[PDB]
Design a protein around this motif. Structure first.
Motif, mmCIF file in Angstrom:
data_model
loop_
_atom_site.group_PDB
_atom_site.id
_atom_site.type_symbol
_atom_site.label_atom_id
_atom_site.label_comp_id
_atom_site.label_asym_id
_atom_site.label_seq_id
_atom_site.Cartn_x
_atom_site.Cartn_y
_atom_site.Cartn_z
ATOM 1 N N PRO A 223 4.816 5.369 2.341
ATOM 2 C CA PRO A 223 4.787 4.930 0.961
ATOM 3 C C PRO A 223 5.263 3.489 0.712
ATOM 4 N N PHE A 224 5.844 2.756 1.611
ATOM 5 C CA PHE A 224 6.271 1.398 1.231
ATOM 6 C C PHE A 224 5.609 0.426 2.207
ATOM 7 N N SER A 225 4.339 0.725 2.515
ATOM 8 C CA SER A 225 3.667 -0.172 3.477
ATOM 9 C C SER A 225 3.190 -1.477 2.889
ATOM 10 N N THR B 277 11.164 -2.721 -4.052
ATOM 11 C CA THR B 277 11.279 -3.425 -2.752
ATOM 12 C C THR B 277 11.388 -2.402 -1.651
ATOM 13 N N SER B 278 10.982 -2.775 -0.462
ATOM 14 C CA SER B 278 11.054 -1.883 0.649
ATOM 15 C C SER B 278 12.153 -2.337 1.607
ATOM 16 N N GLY C 172 8.619 -6.956 -1.416
ATOM 17 C CA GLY C 172 8.597 -6.337 -2.759
ATOM 18 C C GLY C 172 8.127 -7.417 -3.752
ATOM 19 N N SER D 161 4.959 6.829 -4.449
ATOM 20 C CA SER D 161 3.817 6.365 -3.676
ATOM 21 C C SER D 161 2.566 6.491 -4.535
ATOM 22 N N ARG D 162 2.754 6.246 -5.821
ATOM 23 C CA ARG D 162 1.703 6.231 -6.783
ATOM 24 C C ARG D 162 0.788 4.977 -6.774
ATOM 25 N N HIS E 88 0.845 -1.221 0.000
ATOM 26 C CA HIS E 88 0.000 0.000 0.000
ATOM 27 C C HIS E 88 0.875 1.263 0.000
ATOM 28 N N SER E 89 0.600 2.315 -0.815
ATOM 29 C CA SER E 89 1.484 3.492 -0.814
ATOM 30 C C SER E 89 1.137 4.522 0.243
HETATM 31 N N1 LIG Z 1 5.006 2.721 -3.144
HETATM 32 C C1 LIG Z 1 5.200 1.957 -4.369
HETATM 33 C C2 LIG Z 1 4.283 0.688 -4.211
HETATM 34 C C3 LIG Z 1 4.498 0.005 -2.892
HETATM 35 C C4 LIG Z 1 3.694 0.167 -1.768
HETATM 36 N N2 LIG Z 1 4.233 -0.637 -0.762
HETATM 37 C C5 LIG Z 1 5.335 -1.281 -1.215
HETATM 38 C C6 LIG Z 1 6.180 -2.173 -0.545
HETATM 39 C C7 LIG Z 1 7.228 -2.661 -1.315
HETATM 40 C C8 LIG Z 1 7.455 -2.299 -2.663
HETATM 41 C C9 LIG Z 1 6.615 -1.420 -3.305
HETATM 42 C C10 LIG Z 1 5.537 -0.900 -2.570
HETATM 43 C C11 LIG Z 1 4.826 2.575 -5.685
HETATM 44 O O1 LIG Z 1 4.085 3.589 -5.689
HETATM 45 O O2 LIG Z 1 5.198 2.101 -6.813
#
Ligand SMILES: N[C@@H](Cc1c[nH]c2ccccc12)C(=O)O
Length: 420
Positions: free
Chosen positions: A240-242, A372-373, A362, A44-45, A35-36
């Protein structure tokens, strides 16, 4: 080689689509959500939802179990290479599509202890969490939520209509409210912390490392639906990398704001940007890892003062993203420098193994790309036990108390949110 793009259906737009479609999947094992955090940036699109993998890969130490329908395979090969063969064997290779960052492929967890399959080091901390070092599913479809286009895209390399009908028949079941059932307890006292901190400074003093990320872990008991903890955290943090991962062994709740590694059409990126004797050396803790795999001369870093990313480079045509992930794993910025030396010290001082924390979540899309986060600000929910870790990079001039306190401050909001 199937290069066909995946078939796509668009669904009506809704500003909560990803939680709306994932709500009813969150108790299915291998159901996963990236989820972004509703965050406002280019990185975070998207929100990505997957479930029902055609194939799964579970690594626990030296073994990786590859399971597909009734078939089950165990192997001791490099789990990322094993991942790469599984992907390759699908023979699905569509063209990159900036509106579909993930077009089916692998998606899941790369836990921190997976780096022991790539880096050799003692094992002293205790394994008190049984959750795979790699828990990854192979998906032939996905639900993509695009915050820049305001579109909801359901895609599949199989029958997208049949995937739709399946997804829209999932019913919203009722869920036990989430509740903490105890206070949070650190795996170390202030004082024990102070000792480990001083031990890291002995090493630095001796020239044995330049930086070590030392973390403590908070633990609590809970009852109720971990999806519910996640809705509330996601809300509060907008990271943004949830991610929300439902595994066979537990739930992973990631409120990570940090990208690990992006690989988009061979272009690599790490973190989004946000006559004399020079006494200072500024080291990017991921530079050497990226430089070992990037195309020579392709690495770019910005001009610093005392490009949209701290590191940008190019993937060689003969490598895969999975190779890039291998080379950087676990992340230099949450271990320290020299990385492996730091990993060893970390394992000496942290009572328990990090498991999912500070690994990476990821996807490796079938089109070749990857995102990947780093799983900081990430809780592990298992057996009514929930864990949340917090670390701080210790350097030569760090101060003990300030560093202790910094660890709380990294996550006090997450913990107090789950309190009240
Ligand atoms: N934020 C990333 C998508 C994303 C959300 N959570 C993540 C966790 C891991 C990797 C990617 C993400 C994007 O907009 O493209």
């Amino acid at each position: 080689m199937k290069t066909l793009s995946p078939a796509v259906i668009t669904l009506l737009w809704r500003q909560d689509a990803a939680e709306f479609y994932f709500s009813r999947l969150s108790h299915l094992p291998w159901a996963m959500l990236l989820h972004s955090g509703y965050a406002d940036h280019p990185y975070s699109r998207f929100d990505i939802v997957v479930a029902e993998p055609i194939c799964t890969l579970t690594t626990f130490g030296k073994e990786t179990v590859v399971s597909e329908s009734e078939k089950r395979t165990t192997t001791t090969d490099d789990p990322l290479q094993v991942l790469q063969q599984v992907l390759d064997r699908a023979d699905i290779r569509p063209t990159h599509n900036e509106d579909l960052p993930f077009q089916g492929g692998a998606l899941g967890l790369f836990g921190y202890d997976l780096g022991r399959r790539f880096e050799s080091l003692p094992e002293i901390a205790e394994q008190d969490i049984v959750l795979p070092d790699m828990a990854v599913g192979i998906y032939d479809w996905a639900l993509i939520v695009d915050h820049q286009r305001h579109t909801v895209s359901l895609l599949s390399h199989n029958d997208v209509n049949a995937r739709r009908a399946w997804l829209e028949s999932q019913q919203f079941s009722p869920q036990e409210d989430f509740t903490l059932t105890s206070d949070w307890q650190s795996n170390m006292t202030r004082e024990q912390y102070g000792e480990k901190f001083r031990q890291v400074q002995e090493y630095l003093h001796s020239g044995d490392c330049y930086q070590v990320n030392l973390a403590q872990r908070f633990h609590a008991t809970y009852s109720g639906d971990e999806w519910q903890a996640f809705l509330q955290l996601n809300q509060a943090n907008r990271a943004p990398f949830s991610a929300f991962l439902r595994l066979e062994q537990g739930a992973i709740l990631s409120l990570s704001p940090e990208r690990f590694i992006l690989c988009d059409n061979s272009e690599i990126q790490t973190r989004p940007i946000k006559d004399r004797a020079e006494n200072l050396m500024i080291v990017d803790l991921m530079r050497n890892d990226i430089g070992r795999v990037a195309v020579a001369g392709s690495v770019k870093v910005p001009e610093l003062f005392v490009l949209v990313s701290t590191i940008t480079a190019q993937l060689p045509e003969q490598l895969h993203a999975s190779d890039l992930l291998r080379a950087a794993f676990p992340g230099g910025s949450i271990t320290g420098a020299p990385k492996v030396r730091a990993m060893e010290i970390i394992d000496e001082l942290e009572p328990q193994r990090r498991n999912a924390w500070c690994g990476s979540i990821g996807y490796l899309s079938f089109c070749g790309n990857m995102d990947t986060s780093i799983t900081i600000r990430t809780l592990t929910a298992i057996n009514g036990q929930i864990f949340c870790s917090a670390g701080g990079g210790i350097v030569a001039d760090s101060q003990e108390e300030a560093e202790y306190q910094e660890t709380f401050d990294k996550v006090n909001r997450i913990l107090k949110q789950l309190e009240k």
